[PDB]
């Protein structure tokens, strides 16, 4: 854990700083062949657009296809992601991303929060760091708090096992020349 939420990732991969600000934040093939991989279809994504202060923003929009008996057919997913302006070319990248769902029982009571943090270590190295919160617009009670609790969290670990794991094969094809 750190301060933010549940600590996720936080590995070091030889892929330089910019080429996973890369592969996870633009529509890469990486990205494509992963959202496919976990039944995310409809990706929509707006450009990446300055604002005043520096930061820049895009929303997207997804659907992901559970096929499951305690969260339905399939939900919309929203998710607004934000390029904060103490990112640096090829040495730093922060993106804090704000994830609602549509449609799953319990959609209106919570969100989550994720934030992603590249790092240089070398030229062709960084760390990469991903800590998640779930937060409430409706604080629910007792079993539940606990039932919301239990599937958000073992989703998001499977989840983000998967992009760590996929990350390590993409590490194996950039660095074989």
């Not at 976990?38 to 005043?52: C, Q």
């Not at 904060?84 to 990248?93: D, Q, V």
């Not at 240089?120 to 919160?133: G, I």
């Not at 983000?160 to 194996?172: A, R, T, V």
Request: glycine fraction near 2%; aromatic fraction near 12%.
């Amino acid at each position: 854990k750190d301060l933010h939420g549940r600590l996720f990732i936080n590995r070091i991969f030889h892929i330089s700083a910019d080429r996973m600000f890369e592969l996870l934040f633009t529509s890469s093939r990486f990205m494509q062949k992963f959202a496919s991989s976990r039944n995310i279809i409809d990706v929509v994504s707006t450009p990446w657009t300055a604002e005043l202060g520096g930061d820049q923003l895009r929303t997207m929009t997804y659907t992901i296809v559970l096929n499951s008996p305690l969260t339905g057919k399939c939900t919309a997913a929203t998710e607004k992601q934000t390029l904060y302006k103490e990112s640096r070319e090829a040495r730093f990248y922060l993106v804090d991303s704000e994830v609602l769902t549509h449609d799953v029982p319990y959609h209106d009571y919570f969100y989550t929060v994720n934030r992603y943090c590249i790092i240089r270590s070398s030229k062709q190295k960084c760390r990469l760091r991903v800590s998640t919160d779930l937060k409430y617009r409706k604080q629910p009670w007792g079993l539940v708090k606990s039932l919301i609790e239990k599937n958000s969290w073992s989703s998001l670990e499977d989840y983000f096992k998967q992009l760590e794991s996929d990350l390590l094969i993409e590490e194996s094809v950039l660095n074989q020349a």
